[model samples]
Target: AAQTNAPWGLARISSTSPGTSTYYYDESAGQGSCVYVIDTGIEASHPEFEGRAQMVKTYYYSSRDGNGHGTHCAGTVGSRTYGVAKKTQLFGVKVLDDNGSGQYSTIIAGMDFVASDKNNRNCPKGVVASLSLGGGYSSSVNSAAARLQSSGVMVAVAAGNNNADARNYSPASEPSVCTVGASDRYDRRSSFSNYGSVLDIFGPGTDILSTWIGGSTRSISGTSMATPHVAGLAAYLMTLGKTTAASACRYIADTANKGDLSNIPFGTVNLLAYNNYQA
Candidate 1:
């Protein structure tokens, strides 16, 4: 079966998804699970995520996307109708404004909220923070992630979209983080996806179809898009009793469709392997 393809044709920067969809259906059922999405926030009423999203917190360091990147990312992970992690509770955090860029302080603050809020009696527990944005490494970010992980909170991050040699960046690059790379429907590395020996695994990032703000659809190409694909699955994996970040990551790596990396730049993530691990 072909993975459902995402819409494309917006912009071309460092990378473009292999222009394929590798999504496969799993019989695994989803009960209510919680995953925190630290991105530009969603449209709240988009049909794909209508009753599926809960805006737990909104960090306003940057303008929310009129561009729809955040909404698209949101749909990938938690949209009940179309997302991989359907039925999981999504906590949206608006860190990057519409420009898709924000200060380090703002990003950290957003993360802090997720970590601290989870401990409050009024908030939920076992939260997995999913980050689709990042840059060069930072000790502060790493420390923050360490603290979060120590508290049983897991972080899922993107391995930067830049086609550079360095795939290790703060938070994502940090130890204990489930650093995700991008792969196509064929399990080949996307031309623009960043790679390094430290990367944990890859997910569907090429030409992904996700919910957009304003009720429109957009196809994006980047490790950012790919990150959510794994994040969504991780959420479901937890529901299956793979509770910790490391355990969930191992399931993804061991389950994905192994690919042909003999001639490719980086290795591929086996998209279909998840079927074998499905409960």
Candidate 2:
């Protein structure tokens, strides 16, 4: 029942890059760090959270996660059974709707909420935002994402699932955020993951298993899934030190510079997310 025996994504990151079949992590396991999930929302009642997950902010003014996307991403971030950092706290920031879409107004408001709450926590903790949603470029959204990072919360975003250039996507296009692409267990980019210059790294995104609605788990794929792995990795590595987004991103890239990722197209960074049991 250890994380060492968990999902493939978990198994992949904890081992050194190029990767191995079994997962391993530090005993701290992101104990004092926190991951802020920016998606449709999360199912806080799910037992996988062990009460660590909270619906701290929402655009819809409710606590329910109608679409299962948020819950799945949250699990990969820090669920007890499926997470990259098993002991990290999880905060669900519901900007997108159950249909997995949201207006820029609501989306930026959610961003501001997290930015504001960064100082409201009872005690400071290393923070990262897992933004698994994106669309065409928006100057406003790009600025909002930049401000979030400026406020000191490391932000990791999906490099759109278009299979084309990631440079054209919203926050992913925002240079300040850590952009992520999707890779499979075989260390190949998932066909649907957007690539190109905007991507800062890649992570396991195919057939990923994580928490769903109704206290269960589901397998899904996308750069969305890939982003949370890095988000959780950021949270894990930020423990104690590595407090700056620059520091965390550096370690992730350098460690994953150690990856054996295959078949990468032109323009994308060759880095994959790696923890090296260093969390």
Candidate 3:
């Protein structure tokens, strides 16, 4: 299998933080699960992926990631080293274009595509949807997320990079999704991450390194990066037989590290944590 240096994102997320001797690694991790990244698209042929990616071009344009944002998110979700779920099947559902911009309807359509039999049958056990894009609130997107959750598809969304409350964002504010905020390498909330009661969890996002377009890798920051860590964990849980969206979300919250953040509403939700038993 293709490989890369162990990512700090993974080290921070594992059961023991960097210096601890009991860092966890599981060769059997993340098999028999699927994740759909609804973003700009993916470089499916990226070496880190080991050729286990599928691409769906929802937009009229090509599905290749021109901006590299989507590819970075996908790498964190399931690349060989940066990933939380190393062996999971990955799908690129292109909603945003090369410019990292798209309409709300395109996002909803991407969601529908993931939930439909066309995609679900290919991943019959179930699927998790990772959305790293958001804008103003959209009832349609909210409803679509709810509907997908109702049908057993787990959805993880970014809590928005703005410093304001996450309650103002669309799907992040929506009740049915796992809205994630960014945490830095120090396990403190990133200054740019959105918080408030609407956010469900926090993950490493600041200066995180992961795969990029054109078979390369790079470091970037955003709540977008945090979202995929949760998404990858949810998919990893699915491989353990926690297949339903609700159940996976519950397990993620219950097992998370609660003391990582001291901020008010941000502290109310759990921080992502992984361990030997978890793997």
Candidate 4:
């Protein structure tokens, strides 16, 4: 798999965050059942995803490989740590082109498929949906995203790499969606991260190493990378019987390092405190 500008095969969050790793030891890695990834595309045969990923569905919303955005995003959220979650399945929905852009209709359609898929019992049954892409917010899609959230589907959305207010984007800005902002390996927000009241959680995104396009890997930077850390964490939450999106979001915020609320736009959402889960 050739690498792209997105963080792909990066270090596990456990190895980086000692506190988080300790928590993982006390809890568990994401082990519920299956997880779905609606992105540009995925390298299903990659060593990290082999035997574990299921490309059960795909829709070519744009030209192929226009920019390799989708593949990069997938690597961050679900690429196996060699064999960490080899049993986890991945469902890919190609809603963008190689140019790294797509229409709202295309993206929403992708979500619709994931939300509406009946052939794969794992999806609606409780699998998390990790979407590393975003567009201008649509009331209809927000309604749909909200529905998914209410239905126990963990919908993770990137806060965008625009370095502006995160509330500017759709899905990300939607109250029902889990808006993810980017932080570096050092646990600092990237210069390009979009922050706002709607921002739900922050994760490691800069210099992340993950699967690329041609059976290779490279380091990349963006909010797209950060979103998956929450996604993977969401899976772990699901395994612990935390099925609802609000619960999953709560867990991430509560478990996260919440020191600088002053600089963080519009107050913070205490994920851990939301459900009375202690650290």
Candidate 5:
């Protein structure tokens, strides 16, 4: 389970990039966690997934990926080549259509599906909901996420791509979920990422390369891309025995960078910093 090589984003977070001591969180690579990617969809059959990825639900279309956004996020969450939790169960909940657009109702339905315990679909250890899509503030969507969190699900949402306050966004502004912002390789806040007190943490989101549809790979940037990293890390933390959503959130906030970021506001320290292991 040790990784000798890692994607650039993972490398930066894990301190495994060039000129650093090789470190691995083998025990935290999501052995018994489920990550639900609520987005366009997932390729399901992508090579990096090795048959672990599947489409569990859909709102307006087939579970198959059409826009490649979901697959890319899924890969970063659990794919062997680009993931933080390489062994986690990957499920795609397609809330968006081929045009990368979905109604707020559809997104709420997707969250409901993720929160459901019907037939024990969610992992026994825990479930981490990774949402990489965002729009104007919606109390319905925010309430859905809050309900899911109360049900013991860890939700990680993007702090919109606009260079404005994340408090203006829905799930990001929502108090219960972990709102993630985007950071570059140098640990600076991404030029286009939203910031403010609403953000729980920041992750590598600039030019991140991961699995795409058609078994391809591509590099993209956005606060959307940064969200899955936190989701995957939350799953990893769950596997390491931080079973509750609150505990996982606390661990992330407690261990995040307190002073290394140059672009963060004077009193902010929400930038993510990886720990090689739990103990």
Candidate 6:
């Protein structure tokens, strides 16, 4: 069960406790799954992707991700070496710009593009989107999340890094998306993670390493990092035929390890996400 090679984030989710570096996992490894990364953009050529990751959409003219946020997020979702679903297909939906900022209208447009999607044999089993960006409350953005779910795409979004109640944020406050909070390697809530009843689950976010721009890697923190883990988990569950909002969300919460985290604020679910992999 413990090989002592996997990243802490990967290892932490595959096991029931936070004791080993080994990331236990099933052979499937989320094969036949698809996760759209909606953020700054992804570096399609990152060697970690091994051709499984690519840019499928963009708001700007060319070279979608220049800031490195989306590539990092994409890596956690499906990179071969650092990803949760190593074989899953990754679609980069560039909404935020090089400076990591975009309009709500732009984001909704990205979600719309995902909602209006194409199905292929490469990832015919499941479809999900990892939204690691957010802002102040916006009904338009929240409604976009609802639209994505109705289109049969499960969206996993970040619960902001403000360390405040998540209710003040848009997509995070939206019930249509699976709002994710951040936790540290110690299984405790990250000090900067947003909290509230809106959070559906927690995943490792502190000092987490993943692919960066230009075929490199970096460690970062944020609910942004945490959302991809749940996105990958949802993708894995989708490959298991958990295709609906209710079904996928239920498995993510019900299978999650309980009482293992600390510094949980009131009105939040203290559950840490798990992948149901065997040793």
Top candidate, metric lDDT: 6
Clash list (residue pairs), candidate 6: none
Tell me, by TM-score, which candidate is best.
6
Weakest ten-residue segment in model 2 by summed lDDT = 14-23
- Name the runs in model 4 displaced over 4 angstroms: 1-12, 15-28, 61-67, 82-87, 123-125, 242-246, 260-279
RMSD of each: 5.3, 1.9, 2.6, 5.4, 2.2, 1.6
lDDT per model vs. reference: 0.65, 0.84, 0.79, 0.61, 0.82, 0.87
Q: What digit string (tens of lDDT, one per residue) describes model 5 on residues 1-279?
A: 446656667876666232342336665478778988999999998889988888888886477889999999999999988888888999889999988898888898888888884236758668889999888888888999898788778899999999888777887889889898888877678899888888888888998889999889999999888899889988888887754676676678777655555578744455574655632
Candidate 3: count of backbone clashes, pairs at least 3 residues apart or interchain: 1
Model 3, 16-42: lDDT tens digits are 453232225455457877888999888
Error of 3 at 89 (Å): 0.5
Per-model TM-score on C-alpha atoms? 0.82, 0.95, 0.91, 0.80, 0.93, 0.96
| Error of model 6, residue 26, in angstroms | 0.9
Q: What tens digits encode model 2's per-residue C-alpha lDDT throughout 145-245?
A: 99998888888999988888977889889988889999988878898988887788898999999999988889998999999999988887787465556
In terms of lDDT, model 6 sits at 0.87
Model 5, residue pairs in steric clash: none
Q: Give the TM-score of candidate 1.
A: 0.82
Per the 3 Å backbone cut-off, how many clashing residue pairs does candidate 1 have?
A: 14
Candidate 5 regions with alpha-carbon error over 4 angstroms: 16-23, 117-119, 266-268
List residue ranges in candidate 3 displaced over 4 A.
Answer: 1-5, 16-23, 117-120, 264-267, 275-279
Point out the higher-scoring one by TM-score: 3 or 6.
Answer: 6
